[PDB]
Symmetry: C3
Amino acid sequence: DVLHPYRDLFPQIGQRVMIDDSSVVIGDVRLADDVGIWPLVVIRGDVHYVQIGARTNIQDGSMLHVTHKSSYNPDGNPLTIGEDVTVGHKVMLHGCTIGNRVLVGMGSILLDGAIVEDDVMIGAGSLVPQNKRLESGYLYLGSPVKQIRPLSDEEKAGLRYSANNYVKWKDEYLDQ
Amino acid sequence: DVLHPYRDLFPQIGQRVMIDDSSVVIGDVRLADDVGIWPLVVIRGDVHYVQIGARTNIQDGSMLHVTHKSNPLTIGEDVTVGHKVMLHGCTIGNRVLVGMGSILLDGAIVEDDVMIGAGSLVPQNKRLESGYLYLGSPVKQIRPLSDEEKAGLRYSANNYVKWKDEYLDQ
Amino acid sequence: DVLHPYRDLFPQIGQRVMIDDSSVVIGDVRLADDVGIWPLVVIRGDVHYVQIGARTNIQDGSMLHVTHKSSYNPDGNPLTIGEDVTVGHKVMLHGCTIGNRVLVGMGSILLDGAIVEDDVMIGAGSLVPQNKRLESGYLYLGSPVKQIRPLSDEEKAGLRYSANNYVKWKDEYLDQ
Ligand SMILES: [Zn+2]
Ligand SMILES: [Zn+2]
Ligand SMILES: [Zn+2]
């Protein structure tokens, strides 16, 4: 009872996907293999689609939506998330684009049109302005975010570690 | 069951009101016609009442409460309360857009035709002058809204009323 | 059904504890007497435990989790909260330690390793960095927080009243 339709739009689920019973997934939401949706999360893909790549976790209390229809976006815009992405607790993602191996710090807000490239870390409580592009391989922090410094190889490997740890984490629940 | 009581208080609902099955509305909460309460929203009107005007949307993940007595929450018509907004014992006029993730504190007063940027914080008792854009934590008055932006405030509410009806028809 | 087990770990509940039907409590979560868990709250004590002291309120929309397992903390770390603590609406607590008689302003984020001593007030929308220690008897505000000023005797008394009032409000809901 966690998946809901919007007109004739319904979530498409891959293999080993975990969606907490307390969460709400509405409309055109594509969840790739090993995606884990934790407690009290809302993902709404009504005016456009939401695409979440393999081995990506959407942590507790996050809210994911697409860009609404307006003069700037007559048909709105989708929310796209790559593979091995760690979306922290209470993160707000709105019609943005996130690449692969990205860690979005808990409590952050990513606005419409924002584009986050691969291997990027966003500190907790950050705000990414509309249409802002976050260059690959850097640490961003602040409200609004500022490019702080490039990530070390160890840090970049940690991005993969985070995604893998959460894949094992959701499997432990699908196992219970 | 999305409506719940508090003592002798229970929510009063107008016409064509949508309340997502995952939301929680408690106590003296008054929702006017065409109000739309989206997923995972909590509106608690126990310590005091919560009044929401016609054609106003309360988006996903918002949390609405009143001042802790030791002040009611009043929202006007055609108001767009963004996703994850925290409203606490404040007063909001008509045609106001509260940017997603914002926090409006006790005693705050927002006049008509105002836009608050996403992730902003409006301090206790702060009054936001009509016709301006405010943003920041705490908010700062940035600039007056253009006529197109004001029309945008109306469109935002209009669009969400249609959006609400879309779900009700299902 | 608000209590859920994580493997053979299950919440331990004291006397007169209120847990809203819309909330989610998972795993090793220990709630002392008179604790009140309000609507849409998630408390997850899976990799480690969450310990909440007596007469403490966890307000609507809060998200409580423990420090994740990592090369730094192989078995993770617990989230510990003292007695007479007021955790404001939408607060994010993550593997930190909070003393007694503390008020955490709504919308705040407290990160891993943070330590909040007794009789402290944190303003709404604040962010407490990892491992930061907040000295007893002061007001902290900001993102990241800064020590603003000492709390007045009136304010220190208010911390007690805040907790007391929420215990009363908790009971009103329990009796109905
Ligand atoms: Zn939206
Ligand atoms: Zn409150
Ligand atoms: Zn966590």
